[PDB]
Design a protein around this ligand. Structure first.
Ligand SMILES: Cc1ncc(C[n+]2csc(CCOP(=O)(O)OP(=O)(O)O)c2C)c(N)n1
Ligand SMILES: Cc1ncc(C[n+]2csc(CCOP(=O)(O)OP(=O)(O)O)c2C)c(N)n1
Ligand SMILES: [Ca+2]
Ligand SMILES: [Ca+2]
Ligand SMILES: [Mg+2]
Ligand SMILES: [Mg+2]
Lengths: 808, 811
């Protein structure tokens, strides 16, 4: 019975010991806190001492929620063993990092006005902790550590972690958002590792999936990780957070949900939460519905270590333990560093206005550096002369940054050959030995061989011809989104599944090998994404940043769901180049079109992307033909320019028999930003008979062309704007001049009056081309608060009303 | 040996769910792949009996997850109810469950046969969600609760309408949007004498976005019923029943954000009952590509919610877990998650052969008999029903299938906002009417005193004007709900709606004193002010839902900076701006978006006026950027008293809060009304001559003060500055009447701080020359140049650009 009380007691400490650990350096919560010499083979006093030291000191360990027994066993074996005391050299090294952090903070708060919001005072221990992460990654012989973080302590991280000189850091608010790169050299090791920091907006947590994509991109380049020869995942994501942001931002859960996915895994992220137990003026009880700000990470069974920021030794030990766990199980580790925010939220803030108790406690708190220096003499680890030299190291570090900053102040063809089209065509039939194709998929493969040799190439095959030819030319092609392998409209079939074994076959991957048998250097990476927009779009944006030579495409189920990724569109994709000098070549594929499927299956919001656009930020397009889409993708991947491309892609037009292209359009043409009717360019049509000109974009062209053909209207011409942004001013002016007898011009669109290209075109076209578009009138749906009507019947009436008005 | 028993007990309680027979498809083969049994162990029970209890409780058709819960009493409550030998259900209860499976399959057969293009909405393989939901609602009625509000995606929605909400087929199939509309009904107990209201909220196609909307809605109903957090009783008598899909629950961030609200004082609803229809597929995507955890529900561990994984082919276990979930919610006022393991009989889209992408799963599904047929056959095998009883169950199925076919066949064969001085003075005095022994922080004491001074002597600033508007509404009996990030104090240390005791930390809400009339009687009003969690998506969704749940409430959500509201885009796009036109669902929610170019960067400058103006259509939203405190006071009072349910978008100030020119007089609150268009006081009250004006500057917001200062400095009598206070709907008549008073105007300019592709110019530059061609033909723009970001990252560039605007305007 007494031996059973010991077993229950062991479980109690392992399971719930963290609830009694002395982790809070402020001690704000008061309520928080025989057979002893008999052997059970160790004495009961020694088993309890091991359990109190492991689970109830300055580290709160949460690991019994992990479903993997080997992971639980790994943690308790390393957590319960009696650890060797750190060497005086390691203790002095930790202290020097705390001297540099505090010196940098004192300088930053004294020299400049308006920097209290960015202060790391009360949280300087994050610097020796981050240093231990990076030194441990270098010890494992890893290649790079990429950091993502908020503004708090950023300039401190650049100096004391990234190793950027003060002349670069204080040269000429944007410094808090820019990316950086450096080299970390081991102090007591002979290894080095690249350390980089990614750019981010003020939007807390939005960079989380961006970092993951950047890291995965770098991993695939180094041939490490998921799409690599080795399982080292030699590029480590180090992600910093705030306690209020980590608990309340949905992107955190979405990014955690990507951690073990074949398309998004980076072999585990090291998470550091700077838990200062405050969110601006908000208390944790108003910021989260759980004990810990880190409880979201339990979602993927990640071990969590709550650690007292006033103990830099435990902080550095947990950092190294986190790296080793990540290396052993290729899974996320979360370090909850409990600490405090010495200063207020904004400038001129008296934080005792909203938190009087916390700030009366903080006013009695001596610094982490002073506390650690005093604890070293108390423990007899350092002498008085050594403590004096440490104070002189702090003073010299304080003088150095003041002195250095003082000195700084005083101072292309996209056409492919027939053989290329035929090769991609044949690849759809070059099935592995014994592969069983599903009977409904077999005619698609055969039709693609027929299309490649005989023409009448549809949208779905043209996309694969564009990507296939890029892979054949040595390019890495990454394509992903919801159900992207098959296609939402059962049109892609980039991955085909064996009817009998379930084995996947990727026909385009055969073009990664030249006809002679040698590799091209190209690769096709095609994945079904998780049911996320924010994290998935963020990941793909980050991927194009991490590998600028990659063709990176993200596909929306319907364009209507990309508003769930608005923060990435607004904060990264559309503005990152102008704000940070950070470039991305990410493609967003947005299925768009009025077909009567409702307000959430109709629009990718063209008007919003056109509004976000400014000269040289993005390319926005709605191609009407498969070949033009093929040339758009090939130009985007080969132009040597890093700029996002936004494409409004079809749904019903995928299977429209008029929306097919000839071999000559792929082999002897280029992307055409403005398209005329084939009857004028190739046929016997007379442009001089035209008195009414209809300017349009997308699938409605086919309907307008069908009505023109039906009524035999020689007086009407339909001109297509294929590239919406930048406006193809030169081509649009020279095209329209070919119709001299035009007396009226109309912009025709399916979208309501306040949506589509009209709100920007109606204003821009008469300004950019006043001799051509003065008196431009609109034919569209009436302005609506939704992208369309909920009724198929209303849709059909409205669609006919547009065609009747155009030919009225 | 006794220690091996204790470790074994923990193993079953902690990990037993990994070996439970929960998957009705049995897709994972590897899942399932000494003498001491008769010896008694310490209560003293035999090892064989300890293990039989464990296997039955943790390894049968219910996988229980609860040892992650930090509360020992909650862990004790679950194991005491799960580890006891349960009474076998009565033949009447078993027949009742079967009639609910009969009802559900008849509806599915009818819907798939009668109409084309309904396979994507099919519940076939998941029919057991109906007897499960029925058991939730019957259990809530058993507790004597007032309402169950459901939020769900499209799968099984019409079925839910018919057999849960109880809507007649004539209403469900009328002129066959029905998959998105709200509904309300009454549930009457079969074997009880209670009744309960059952409602279903409207929702977009955007999976999981309705999740915080439901919470808001339910909280509002709870506050009306004086139950829960803001009530006399802790019954939380309005239960949220939230339905989900396995792929959407694991991948949508809003799920975590809505779970994070579960125990917050400003957002708690007393626990939600979550039902996940886990058909182990997401369109064509396998769970291993949809999530990084063993279960789709693993996000719910974040708040320490018990999780029950249950085999959907066992409707008895499904109904038992539903009632256990309601009892847990009632006992601990926390979330319960039911992971109903099932399958998707048909494909994703119409004409989909799901064996194309999932051949194995669908070869298994092709051998699966229905949940109804499986339950009828198991009851025969268990001797619970006779052959005649099974035949009568087949007759009941045929009868319900005929009934819906027959009923659908028959269906086919057919204002002043001005307050008195005393009202301003009362709100002013309330800031000094401190509780006995309350200690005011020294920096907060002059704010309270200035508000008493402002109320009596004038020079009223923006922050006090807002509190005067909300204070007077509370005094008139209105419920006022105000929230957002650091909203109690205000991001710009300007509000102080809640003041904190310097010595005890106790909160004091001065405006709450206005809920009591001077005689001592209640007004019926209340001030509910909260600091939100660091969420935009969930918080905006919550406030939208709150205004839907209580249309007579003044509901305001405040952004830290307007620049962060894009994190709530799905709510703006799918509910606020479009809910009325799409579902006939109305909301009077106010969004306060701090906006203005001050050099604080591209994430501290714009609430994106151009995006809200683009979303706008006649009668959907009111969009405003007031320039004076009194005009903001009248905007809020008109919004709350106009008797119209329409969202209001307000672009609020940052530096203009403390601008001494941006102050108002008592008479502006006492003898005025909201002005959509504002002229310069020199023309309305001064000795200015409107006839001297040849150049007219049309503008909105804080830049007015800079333009007015430049005019006063250069003594420019030839320039007038007209303000558009209400951006949407355009104040066409007031704008036309005002411009008509300046007859010698030869040039007109729209002046704005925002880049040319942003602000009000993209819509105004197009609309104004069309709506008023005699006034705005030849309208020119003065603004920042078009940008890919809301502004520059440099304060220096900002300052040069701002001066360039003022120099151009007076050049
Ligand atoms: C997405 C987003 N929402 C709101 C803000 C505004 N904001 C800036 S600091 C802050 C509180 C930060 O809390 P926390 O995460 O605990 O970090 P800390 O400042 O304490 O290090 C907020 C809400 C923001 N920058 N981003
Ligand atoms: C937010 C959002 N993103 C994408 C979609 C498109 N979509 C429709 S159904 C589906 C897969 C649904 O998976 P699941 O949650 O498991 O539900 P199920 O259809 O299996 O019941 C998706 C991605 C959507 N409706 N909402
Ligand atoms: Ca490019
Ligand atoms: Ca109203
Ligand atoms: Mg914090
Ligand atoms: Mg599913």
């Amino acid at each position: 019975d007494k031996n059973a009380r010991v077993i229950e007691l062991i479980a109690a400490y392992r399971n719930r010991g963290h609830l009694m650990a002395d982790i809070d350096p402020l001690r704000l919560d008061n309520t928080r806190f025989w057979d002893l010499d008999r052997e059970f083979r160790k004495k009961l006093r020694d088993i309890l001492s091991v359990l109190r030291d492991a689970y109830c000191r300055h580290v709160g360990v949460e690991y019994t929620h992990i479903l993997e027994p080997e992971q639980q066993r790994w943690i308790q074996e390393r957590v319960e063993t009696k650890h060797d005391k750190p060497t005086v050299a390691e203790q002095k090294y930790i202290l020097s990092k705390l001297n540099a952090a505090e010196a940098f903070e004192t300088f930053l708060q004294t020299k400049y006005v308006g920097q209290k919001r960015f202060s790391l005072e009360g949280a300087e221990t994050v610097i020796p902790m981050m240093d231990a992460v990076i030194d441990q990654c270098a010890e494992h012989g890893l290649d790079e550590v990429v950091i993502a973080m908020p503004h708090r302590g950023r300039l401190n991280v650049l100096a004391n972690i990234v190793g950027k000189p003060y002349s670069q850091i204080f040269s000429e608010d944007v410094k808090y958002h820019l990316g950086a790169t450096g080299t970390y050299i081991q102090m007591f090791g002979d290894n080095d590792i690249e350390v980089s920091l990614t750019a981010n907006p003020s939007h807390l947590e939005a960079v989380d999936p961006v970092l993951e994509g950047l890291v995965r991109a770098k991993q695939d380049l180094l041939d490490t990780g998921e799409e690599g020869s080795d399982n080292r995942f030699s590029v480590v994501p180090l992600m910093l957070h705030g306690d209020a942001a980590f608990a309340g931002q949905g992107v955190v859960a979405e990014t955690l949900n990507l951690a073990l996915l074949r398309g998004y895994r980076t072999g585990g992220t090291i998470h550091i939460v700077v838990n200062n137990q405050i969110g601006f003026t908000t208390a944790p009880t108003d910021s989260r519905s759980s004990e810990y700000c880190t409880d979201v990470a339990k979602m993927i069974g990640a071990p969590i270590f709550h650690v007292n920021g006033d103990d830099p030794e435990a902080c550095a030990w947990v950092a190294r333990l986190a790296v080793d766990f990540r290396q052993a199980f290729k899974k996320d580790v979360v370090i909850d560093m409990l600490c405090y925010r010495r200063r207020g939220a904004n400038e001129g803030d008296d934080p005792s206005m909203t938190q009087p108790y916390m700030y009366d406690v903080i006013d009695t708190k001596r610094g982490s550096r002073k506390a650690y220096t005093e604890a070293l003499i108390g423990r007899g680890d350092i002498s008085m002369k050594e403590a004096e030299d440490a104070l002189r190291d702090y003073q010299g570090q304080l003088e150095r940054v003041f002195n250095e900053v003082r000195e700084l102040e005083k101072h292309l063809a996209t056409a492919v050959d027939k053989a290329m089209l035929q090769r991609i065509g044949d690849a759809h039939l070059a099935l592995p030995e014994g592969f069983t194709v599903h009977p409904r998929v077999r005619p698609v493969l055969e039709k693609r061989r027929e299309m490649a040799y005989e023409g009448r190439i549809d949208w779905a095959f043209a996309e694969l011809l564009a990507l296939g030819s890029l892979i054949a030319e040595g390019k890495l092609v990454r394509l992903s989104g919801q159900d992207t392998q098959r296609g939402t409209f059962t049109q892609r079939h980039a991955v085909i599944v064996d009817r009998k074994t379930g084995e996947e076959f990727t026909p385009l991957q055969l073009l990664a090998t030249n006809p002679d048998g040698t590799p091209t250097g190209g690769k096709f990476l095609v994945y079904n994404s998780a049911l996320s927009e924010f994290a998935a779009v963020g990941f793909e944006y980050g991927y194009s940043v991490g590998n600028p030579d990659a063709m990176v495409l993200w596909e929306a189920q319907f364009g209507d769901f990309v508003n769930g990724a608005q923060s990435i569109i607004d904060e990264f994709i559309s503005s990152g180049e102008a704000k940070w000098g950070q470039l991305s070549d990410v493609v967003l594929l947005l299925p768009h079109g009025h077909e009567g499927q409702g307000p959430d299956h109709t629009s990718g919001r063209i008007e919003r992307f056109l509004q976000l656009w400014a000269e040289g930020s993005m390319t926005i397009a709605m191609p009407s033909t498969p070949a033009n889409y093929f040339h758009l993708l090939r130009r985007h991947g080969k132009d040597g320019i890093q700029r996002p491309l936004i494409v409004f892609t079809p749904k019903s037009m995928l299977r429209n028999k008029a929306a097919v292209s000839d071999i000559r359009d792929f082999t002897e043409s280029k992307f055409r930003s403005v398209l005329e009717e084939p009857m004028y360019t190739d046929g016997e049509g007379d442009r001089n008979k035209v008195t009414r000109l209809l300017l349009t974009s997308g699938k409605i062209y086919y309907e307008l062309a069908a009505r023109k053909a039906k009524e035999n209207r020689e007086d009407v011409a339909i001109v297509r704007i294929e590239q919406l942004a930048p406006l193809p001013r030169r081509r649009l002016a020279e095209t329209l001049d070919r119709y001299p007898n035009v007396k009226e011009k109309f912009w025709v669109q399916e979208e309501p009056a306040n949506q589509g290209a009209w709100p920007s075109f109606g204003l821009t076209l008469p300004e950019i081309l006043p001799d051509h578009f003065t008196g431009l009138k609109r034919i569209s749906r009436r302005a609506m608060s939704a992208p369309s009507s909920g009724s198929s019947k209303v849709h059909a009436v409205e669609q006919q009303e547009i065609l009747d008005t155009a030919f009225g």
